[PDB]
Structures are given as structure tokens and as C-alpha cells.
Design a protein around this ligand. Structure first.
Ligand SMILES: Nc1ncnc2c1ncn2[C@@H]1O[C@@H]2COP(=O)(O)O[C@H]2[C@H]1O
Ligand SMILES: Nc1ncnc2c1ncn2[C@@H]1O[C@@H]2COP(=O)(O)O[C@H]2[C@H]1O
Ligand SMILES: Nc1ncnc2c1ncn2[C@@H]1O[C@@H]2COP(=O)(O)O[C@H]2[C@H]1O
Ligand SMILES: Nc1ncnc2c1ncn2[C@@H]1O[C@@H]2COP(=O)(O)O[C@H]2[C@H]1O
Lengths: 198, 198, 198, 198
């Protein structure tokens, strides 16, 4: 109940932020609904709490939190738990509201994404390529080629995603060189379909 | 009303800071008036609040906050919204009181500035060169030559400025190489008028 | 008594974290018992408190806190107090619960550990090699070879350990080049027993 | 009066820190007296307060706080105010209690010190070389040679010092190359007296 109060006080603080900056009506609605979807009536200082815990405890916890995502994904469910735990500890939780652009085509990608829950459209030049949903990942291509985004990725629904930076991706694959190929197969496949060796 | 209280408590904390360090009369006045002009009776932990929001929400917000500045400036109003949003997300809000030196001639510039509101004198050797106001930028020269300031820039009034570091400037122009020329035209023009290829 | 309250409030915050993420029964028990063993009914913002103190005061304090560990260890008890204080100021306190994996074989080691109190099994390929306890260190090998872990190290009991990063290890040994050999003797000895020049 | 309360609450927090870690009698006394000498019954979040202020306001403030030190020192009192303000903004306040070792001979120096108030003994091999007091600086030698401390420096009294890191020292002297010589004259002089070109 102090974490429900936390959320309430922090929301009243947001309300005032929005009044002061005279934020427009679509963005106040969006912010209101973002708070409810992500935090759900409670707030915690996750990284403070987790900060006070031991390494193995942070890793039981994150292994539990991403339990279903792990199982969704042959890359994880079939891998050495030490590697999954390595990658998992580097993921950042992000929520996106419907219609949001996650990745914009032709930008410099420094980030990759795994879908816990949601549907995503992959788009090039305003044209639908496929959709991706729970147990898919995207944005891997730029982590490997180290160049420009080959497609746009828009949230079609609310989306619970975990992001993984380019530096964190390489640190893990240095430690687990055998895992690199699996990403490469997927990114070659996708590069075939959209017709690129740029 | 908790953000008005925040400002009040933080101001009483400032008052005590000033008594303890026996701060002189011109600087207590200045500080008093700085608080009122920048914060306006309210305080928020902007970056905490924004921190809790999604990327796209931070970008609606900053696009809204710099809405008029964008429109003031052909560099922005005529550009690809993705680039404007890129640059915008890297800007830092600074306020300067009349008579303040923003840039001192012959220093190493690591920073550039866009004027939301205010008037600025550009000066060399104690001599007025021009004034700049709402919808101008300055300090771009050192971001490009990577050397010494070619003029002083003083605030003639209260000034709402957004600063952009040299590293952030280059990160964006790497992503948007086509935007570099527009800065270069302006900085060549200005280098002509004050007679430098140093 | 405000530090006992601190612990209590932060524990109620943890309880709620655990309910919200529907944490499983073995991990709630573990977390409960971790809090009691590490913090003992009190919490302090150590690094805030220490932050307000002078350097020499931080160093009396840490020299006192690791007083018995120093005396346990010929590397410290026989060394120049300036070097011990150098190393000591770089140590991080970690607690591990029984059965926890401190180091996993074949990972990239960036960290070394000194035992204040506890027993540890050193393991290769699921086979017991030795145990280490109060006044031992481990993980030094990867700090010197800059490669892969040559054994697993599991906590057999509760364990009060101090960790020392690879960068911090080298910064100190640059300042105290004469101390390098002592680690090298130990790591050569251990590399002999498990049969590696990898 | 909320800053006097701040100090009181933070001191009760310290008291508990000391009881819990069963800190010894000389170090509790020292800590008690350190708090009283440095903070004087009040505490402020200086860098939070200063953080909310503009650059020019931070620089009036620090120019005022180090007003007498500036005037004490030909290096400052005779220099371009822009350079003094550059250096000043990079200084960190440190207090040392009598008998404290500020610099230990033969360590790697990354830091230099200016005396606001106090007396210091400079020592080599346990032998007094000179004393330094208000308006002196020391530790400059290692900032220039980038090697080992040529003497020990002990606080003989309470000492209000401002420290300046090696990186900050070079950043300023890059911007103000003309100021380098003045340090060099002093460090050559001192290297003569203690007989070093090491
Ligand atoms: N044909 C496709 N099918 C599924 N996903 C794709 C396809 N084309 C591109 N992507 C994803 O869209 C992402 C856009 O960012 P990247 O180019 O870094 O990596 C891309 C892939 O992860
Ligand atoms: N003649 C001018 N007209 C307008 N602005 C100028 C002129 N000369 C210099 N400036 C600006 O003053 C700034 C001082 O810092 P910079 O040299 O980095 O870049 C300079 C320009 O942005
Ligand atoms: N035979 C052994 N006896 C004691 N400790 C060992 C032995 N073999 C390995 N270790 C320790 O186990 C550690 C595993 O990590 P490192 O390879 O970095 O360094 C290793 C040593 O510190
Ligand atoms: N003879 C001396 N007189 C005054 N100060 C000295 C003398 N010798 C050394 N020092 C100072 O003592 C400092 C010890 O650290 P450094 O060698 O970096 O720089 C040294 C000088 O700042």
C-alpha cells in the first residue's frame, strides 16, 4: 500500500507537470494511459531494491520475470542458462502505446528488441512487410552490420518489450561466441526478403 | 500544489545557503530573481518524471515544448521531423539574466545555443557586431572548426536558451549528414563579417 | 532507531515488490533471509555517510572494518599499510547465500574475491578441487591472464566476501608493482594443480 | 533552520553507523569533530542547489567563496578572471584534521591542492622540508611529470583545502596555455631544493 501511494503521488506530480507545460489533450490522455498500463497502480524503485540484493538474487528474479519470453524463444529456451542469464541481466523494459514508432527506417540503430507481449508491424517505404509478436525479436540487423535501419517498426497495440544495446549485445557474444550465428541466420533471412546487401 | 510547495521549500533551502556563505547583496538579489524567472513558483523533477515515460512520449513532449522555436527556424521548420526530434532530445534548457556572458571570446567552445526568447549582443574586442534574438542560433563556429571562440556573446535581457554540446551536435550530423551544410553556410557567413580564417 | 525503521520500511517495500511480480516461494524465502543476514535489522546509506567524510576518515573506517581479514592474510598483514589501504578502499562487500555460484567455469572473469567469512567449494567439471574459507582469495587467475574462468566457485554457507574489479586490481599494482608477484605465485600454483597453461 | 535539522538528522544517522560497525574511540571522536568543523551545524545539498542555478550564478558564487584565496595567490590575483573562474569551478573542497596525511611520498599523484586555511608540513624520508600555509599550493609536481610523489604532506592543524585533479588541471591549461609556466617555475624550484630530476 505504500507503493500504491507512491504511484498516486507521482501521478499528481505528473498532472502538475502537464498543467504547467500546458501539454495538449492527446498527450495528456496518452500519458494517463501509459502510467496505468506500465505501472498498474503501483510504483517501486526497482533498481534501488534490486541494488540491495545479491547478484544471484537479481538473476533468479530476472529469470522469473522473463520466464515466458525465454520459453517462447528457441534462442533462449534451447540455450545454456548461463547465457540466457547473461543476456537477461542486460535487457531494459520498455512499453510502447499503439501507433508508436519503435524504429524508424534509415536511422542509425544502436538497439535491439525482444517482444514479451504485443504486435508489431515491420514497414519499408510505408509498405507492410510482416508482423511480429510475442516471442519475436527485431533490430538485430544494425547490431551486426553497424549501419542504417532497413525498416520501420511500429507498435500496433500496447507492447511490452525488452531492449538490448549494441555494446551489451557484443559483450555477451564475446563471452558466448557460439550464439552469434543464430542471430546471423535470422538477419540474413530478413535481409533476403527485403532485398539488401547495402 | 505540491510542486508550488517544492519550489517554496527549495527556496528556503537556498535562502539558508545564502546566509551561511554570507553571499553578497547583488548575488542574493540575482538568485532570488533567477528562481522566479526560471521556475515560476513551481518545481518538478523533470528528468525523473520524463524518466518514467516512454521514448515517444518524451518526444511528443519536447516537440511540444520547443514548438515555437522549431517554427521560428528554417533549419527546423523545413527539416525532416525525425532530425528535429533527434536534435531536440539533446538540447538543454538554460536561462541567463541580463548582462550575463554566455560565451567569452577566445575560450574553447564545446557548446552551441538556440534562442527561444531573449536578445543577445555579439561582441568582439568590446565592439558590437550584431544582436541575435528569438529564432537565432550561435556558437556553431567552434562546433565545426573545433578551435577558439571568435566573439563574446552577452545576454541583454532575460534569455531562454537551449544548448547543444559538440558531441551531441556530431552524433546527430552523423545520423543526418545532409544537415551539416546549413550550419556551415551560417558559420562561413559569420566568419566573413568578422574577418577570420584563423 | 531511524536506521532500524529504514530497514523496516525498505523491507515492506520489498514485500510489495515481491507480491506485485508474483515472486515464487523459494525466492521470497531467500530474499527475506538475505535481508536479515546482510543488513541485520538496520540500513544506512553507507556511501552517502562515507561521502561526507574526509579521505583519511574513510580509510580509518575501512581499515577497521577489514581489520581481521587483513590480519588473516599474509598478503595484507605483511604489507605496507599504504598498499593495503589502497586495495581496501577499492573492495566491494558482497554476501552470498549457501549454494550460490560466485564464479562459473569458462566465463570471462572481471572480478576477484577475498573471503571475510564463509566456506567455498572450488569445482571443475562438477568435481571438487578444494575448499576455501576465511583469509583466502579466489578469481585472481583471470585478472592476470585476462581470459576464461578455470573453475566454478560455489558458496557452501553464507559468505561475506569483498570483490575487486580487474581495473582496480591493475591500478593498485601499477602503484605497487612489488605486490604483483604474490598473486602470481598463488595463481601459478593453482594453475599447476588443475593442469592449465591454456 | 531546516539545514540545522538536516545536519542533526544526518549526525544521528552517523552515530548509528558508528555503533553498528562498533567503530573505535579515536575514530568516533574524530568523526564527531570532523562534522562540527566542516559543516558547522548546518548541511545543504550544495550541488543540488548549485545545480538549479545558471552557470554565471555558480561562478559569482565560487568567485565569492574563494575570494580571499584568490587574493592570497599571485597566480590568481594577477591573472585573467576568466582563467581564475575556469580553475575555480573545478576545485573540490576538502577538510583535513591535524596529523592527517594528504599526500604520501612515492604514491602516484593525480591531484593537487591549494590551501585556503591551515598549516602543512612537507616531509621526505621522515624529515621536515618546509611548511606551507594559507595561499600556498602543493602536489603540482606530479601533475606535470606524471610520476611519483616526491614528498609527504601532512596536515599540522585543521586544513581547508581545495583539490584539483590532473585531468582538470590539463583541461584548463589547454585553454590557458600561458598559465602553465607559473606552475613549472614553482615545481622546478621545489625539485631543486629536494634534489630530483628522477
Ligand atoms: N522481412 C522481415 N521480416 C521480419 N522482420 C524484419 C524484416 N525486415 C526487417 N526486419 C526487422 O526490422 C528491423 C529494422 O531494424 P534493423 O534493420 O536493425 O533490423 C530489422 C529486422 O529486425
Ligand atoms: N557577425 C556575426 N553575426 C552573428 N553572429 C556571429 C557573428 N560573429 C560571430 N557570431 C556568433 O558568435 C559566436 C561566438 O562563438 P563561436 O565562435 O563558436 O561562434 C560564433 C557565432 O555563432
Ligand atoms: N586448485 C585450486 N585451489 C584453490 N583455488 C583454485 C584452484 N583452481 C582454481 N582456483 C580458484 O578458482 C578460481 C576460478 O576463477 P579464476 O580462474 O579467475 O581463478 C581461480 C582460482 O582463484
Ligand atoms: N622543498 C619544497 N618546498 C615546498 N613544497 C615542496 C617541496 N618539495 C616538495 N614540495 C611539495 O610537496 C609535494 C608532494 O607531491 P608532488 O611531488 O606531486 O609535489 C610536491 C610539492 O608540491
Amino acid at each position: 500500500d505504500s507503493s500504491r501511494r507512491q504511484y498516486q503521488e507521482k501521478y499528481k506530480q505528473v498532472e502538475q507537470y502537464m498543467s504547467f507545460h500546458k501539454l495538449p489533450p492527446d498527450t495528456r490522455q496518452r500519458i494517463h494511459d501509459y502510467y496505468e498500463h506500465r505501472y498498474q497502480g503501483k510504483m517501486f524503485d526497482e533498481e534501488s531494491i534490486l541494488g540491495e540484493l545479491s547478484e544471484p538474487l537479481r538473476e533468479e528474479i530476472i529469470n522469473f520475470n522473463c520466464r515466458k519470453l525465454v520459453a517462447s524463444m528457441p534462442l533462449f529456451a534451447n540455450a545454456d542458462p548461463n547465457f540466457v542469464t547473461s543476456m537477461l541481466t542486460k535487457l531494459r523494459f520498455e512499453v510502447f502505446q499503439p501507433g508508436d514508432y519503435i524504429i524508424r527506417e534509415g536511422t542509425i540503430g544502436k538497439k535491439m528488441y525482444f517482444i514479451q507481449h504485443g504486435v508489431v508491424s515491420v514497414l519499408t517505404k510505408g509498405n507492410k512487410e510482416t508482423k511480429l509478436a510475442d516471442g519475436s525479436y527485431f533490430g538485430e540487423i544494425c547490431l551486426l552490420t553497424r549501419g542504417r535501419r532497413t525498416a520501420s517498426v511500429r507498435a500496433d497495440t500496447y507492447c511490452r518489450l525488452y531492449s538490448l544495446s549494441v555494446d551489451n549485445f557484443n559483450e555477451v557474444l564475446e563471452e558466448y561466441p557460439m550464439m552469434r550465428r543464430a542471430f546471423e541466420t535470422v538477419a540474413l533471412d530478413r535481409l533476403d526478403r527485403i532485398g539488401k546487401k547495402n
